[PDB]
C-alpha cells in the first residue's frame, strides 16, 4: 500500500526516463528507472517482474504495471532505517563520517578482532569518493548493494 509520497517519486522517476514520452517503458529502460531510485536489480531478475505480465507490446510495462509491481520488493522491505541507525552507531564521534579508527573500534566491542591492516582495508573498498572515510551514502550502498 505504497504511500502517495511513495508514488510521486515512483512516477517522477518513471517518466524522467521515458524518452518517447508515452506511458510505458522498454526493458533496458525499466532497469534504469530502478537504479536511479537507489535500487539496482540483477540482469535476469529484471524479467520475472515484467516477464510475468505481458499484456502490452510483449516487452513493455506501463505505469499502473510498474506501480503495482512495486510490492514484490517494497511493502516487505522496511530496512532502510535499521541501516541508518547502524550508522550513527559506528559514527562514534558525531562527525557524520565513519573512519577505520571507529570501524575497528566498534568492531572489537561487538567482540571481534580486526587487524589494523584489514580495516584501513575495509574502509577503502567501502569508500567511493576517495576521501579516506565512509559517509552515510556509501555506508548505505556497501550494506544494501548485494
Amino acid at each position: 500500500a505504497a504511500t502517495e509520497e511513495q508514488i510521486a517519486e515512483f512516477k517522477e522517476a518513471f517518466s524522467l526516463f521515458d524518452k518517447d514520452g508515452d506511458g510505458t517503458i522498454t526493458t533496458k529502460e525499466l532497469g534504469t528507472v530502478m537504479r536511479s531510485l537507489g535500487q539496482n536489480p540483477t540482469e535476469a531478475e529484471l524479467q520475472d517482474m515484467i516477464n510475468e505480465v505481458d499484456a502490452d507490446g510483449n516487452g513493455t510495462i506501463d505505469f499502473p504495471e510498474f506501480l503495482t509491481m512495486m510490492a514484490r520488493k517494497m511493502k516487505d522491505t522496511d530496512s532502510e532505517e535499521e541501516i541508518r541507525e547502524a550508522f550513527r552507531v559506528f559514527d562514534k564521534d558525531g562527525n557524520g563520517y565513519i573512519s577505520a579508527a571507529e570501524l575497528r573500534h566498534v568492531m572489537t566491542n561487538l567482540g571481534e578482532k580486526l587487524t589494523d591492516e584489514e580495516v584501513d582495508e575495509m574502509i577503502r573498498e567501502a569508500d567511493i569518493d576517495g576521501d579516506g572515510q565512509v559517509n552515510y551514502e556509501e555506508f548505505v550502498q556497501m550494506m544494501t548493494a548485494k
Partner: protein
Amino acid sequence: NNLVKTEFTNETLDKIQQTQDLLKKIPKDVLEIYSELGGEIYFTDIDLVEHKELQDLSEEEKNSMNSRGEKVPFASRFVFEKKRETPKLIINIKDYAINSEQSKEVYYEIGKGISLDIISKDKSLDPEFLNLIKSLSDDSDSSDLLFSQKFKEKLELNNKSIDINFIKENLTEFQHAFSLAFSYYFAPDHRTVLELYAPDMFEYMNKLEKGGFEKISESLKKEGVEKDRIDVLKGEKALKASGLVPEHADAFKKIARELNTYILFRPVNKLATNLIKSGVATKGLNVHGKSSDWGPVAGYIPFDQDLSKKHGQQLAVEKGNLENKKSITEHEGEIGKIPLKLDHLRIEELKENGIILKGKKEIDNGKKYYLLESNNQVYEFRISDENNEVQYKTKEGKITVLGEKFNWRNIEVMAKNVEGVLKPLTADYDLFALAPSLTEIKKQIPQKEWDKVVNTPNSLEKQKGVTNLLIKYGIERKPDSTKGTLSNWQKQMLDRLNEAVKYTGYTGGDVVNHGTEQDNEEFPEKDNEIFIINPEGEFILTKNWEMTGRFIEKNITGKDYLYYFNRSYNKIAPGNKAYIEWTDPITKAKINTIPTSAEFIKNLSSIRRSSNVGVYKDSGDKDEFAKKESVKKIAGYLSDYYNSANHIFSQEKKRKISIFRGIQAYNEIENVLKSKQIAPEYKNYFQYLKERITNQVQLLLTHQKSNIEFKLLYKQLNFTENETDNFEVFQKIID
C-alpha cells in the same frame, strides 16, 4: 593543551639548547601542576619589556613585593608570571650563559613558584596542617631555628607562636617561602642550601617530588572533569522530581549494573508516586484517559473526564469520556471502572500537598460522611467511613460543562485487570530509552550465527555480515500485540524491570507497560527533564531537551553504548503534528555531500506535489523536453558519482575521477538554472544543490593538492562540444 610555547626559533640551538636545559631541570610534574591550572609558558626572543604579545596592561603591578627579597625595576627583567587567572609564565634570553652565577636562573624558579605556590599545598586545600606545621619549623621542632633566607622582615617575629593565630594574614609571605624553597631544591646549583639552612622544607619539597606534585596533579585533574561538566543534580536530589518510587528506582539501580545499560524515564507525575508505592496498577496502552490533578480523584483516571486536568474543554472532555467507554467496550474483562477508595495515607498526603481539606462531617441515610473540600467550583465531594469510598455531585447552583447535573454518585476510576481483580489505574513508567552496552548486545547474538559470519573471506562482507547482525539482534524494533512497539532485548529488559520491582513489594502487576518513547513515532513528545539511572546506580535528571541530548552524546553515544533516536525526530510527527529537534550527524554533514540519484529525483518528486508544477511539463515545447532530458543527465552524473566499481582505483584517483563526475554535474545544473522558466521553487533547490557539489568538491580537493578553489578551477573548463581532453586538462590543473 601545549604547555610550552616557543616564540622565536630565531637562534639556532643555544636558545633552544638553553630553554630545554631549563625545562628538563624543572620537575616533569611541577609542569603538570602548571599545565593543569590552565597555564602555559612563554619562551620568546628579545621581547624583554612590555613588548610581549601578552605583557600589556591586564593585571600587572599593584603592590610591590617582587624578586626573592625586593627590587621592582621591571625594565630589567626577563621572567614574569601573569599572576591573575590562568598562570602565564613568559621568559626570554639574549646571549649564551645562565650558569656561572645561577643567581639568575633562581628567579625563573620562584618566578615560576609563584604559579603553583598560592594554589599549592599551601592554600588551595587549605594551608593543611602538613604546611601549617611546616611553618612552625620557625623555632619549635628541631634545634634549627634557622630561616634567615625566607623570614627576615615578615617573620623576624620569633616572639609569636605561628599556628592558626595569624598565618591567614600574610599568606603571600609564606608563598615567597614556598617559592624561594622551590627555587633552591630545584635550582641547578644550590640544592643543599635548602638541605642545610632548612631542616624540613627540604624534606618537604622532597616529599613534593616524592609525590606531592603528582597529588595536586590529580585533584586538579579529577576536578578537571567534575568541574566543567554538565549540571545534573544526581543523588536523591533528582530522584525527588523523578516521580519514580524510591524503593523502585533503588530497585532498578540493580539491573542497570547487572546488564550494564542506561535506563531513562520520562517524568512520573508526583500525584501518582505514592499511588504506585501503594499498590495501584499502572496505565498500560489500552487506556487513553486523562490523569487529573485536584480532588480525591487526583492521580487516578476518572471515568469522568470533566474530573481530570481538562476541566472545561467541552470537547476534549467530551471526546475524552468517549475514549474510556471504548477503552472498555473494546478491552472488557481487562479494562473497566471501579469506585474510588482513598485509603489512609493517601489522605494525609493530599493534605499537606494542598489538594484536599478534610473538615466538617455529616449524616445521610445512616452512614458517616466527613466531607471533602476543594475549591473546584461546580463539584462537591464526600467520602464514606464504612468503606472510604468517595462521591460527588453538581453543586446546588451550577451545571456540568457538557450539560449534566447529578446528585451524589460513587466516583469511578479506570482500572485494568490484575490476577482477576479490577485495580484502579495510574501513571506508569514510560522508559525514555534503554541504552544497553554495545558489549551486551554481543551476548544477545547466538554464537552459531555470529561465528558463521566472521569465518568469511571478503573483508568488506565481513562488515556487512556484522552490521546486519548488530541490526538484527540489537537495533530492530518489531511491533507487538501488548507491549507497544519495541526491540527484542528491549522486551526482556522490560520484564526484568518489573520482576525486579515486584520481588520487592509491588502488587499491581507490572509498572513498565510499553516500549521506549523513542519509538513513539506516532505522538512523540518533548520533556525538559529526564531521569537517568546510570549503568552504575548514579541517579540523574537532565534539565534541558539539550542537556539531555548533550548528556547522551557525552557518556552514551560517544561512549560505547548502543542508542537510537526517535525516527520521527526532525520530521513532522503525524499523530500530533509536532516538530521535535535532535542533532543528527548524518544531517550535520549533508552540506558537503553530493546528493544521490534518488535523493535528487526524490526532492523533485516532493516539490512537484506542492507547487503543482514539475521541473518539466508534459508538452511539445522542444524547450521543455530539453529540460526534461537535462535532469535525466544530472540524474546520471550524480548516480555516476557513487559508482560501486570505484574501488578498483586508488585514493588520489577516486577523489579526482569524482571531483569531475561532481563538476560534470555542477555544470548541467548551472546549465538548466539558465534555461527557460523553471518555477522559482526549483530555481532554489538547484541553487542549493550547487553549494553541495561545491562544498563537496572543495573537500575532495582539500584532501590532496589544495590551493585551487572550485570557482576558479571551474572557469578553466571547456564544456563546449567535446568532453574528451577536458579531463586530461583537469589533471595538470591540479599538479
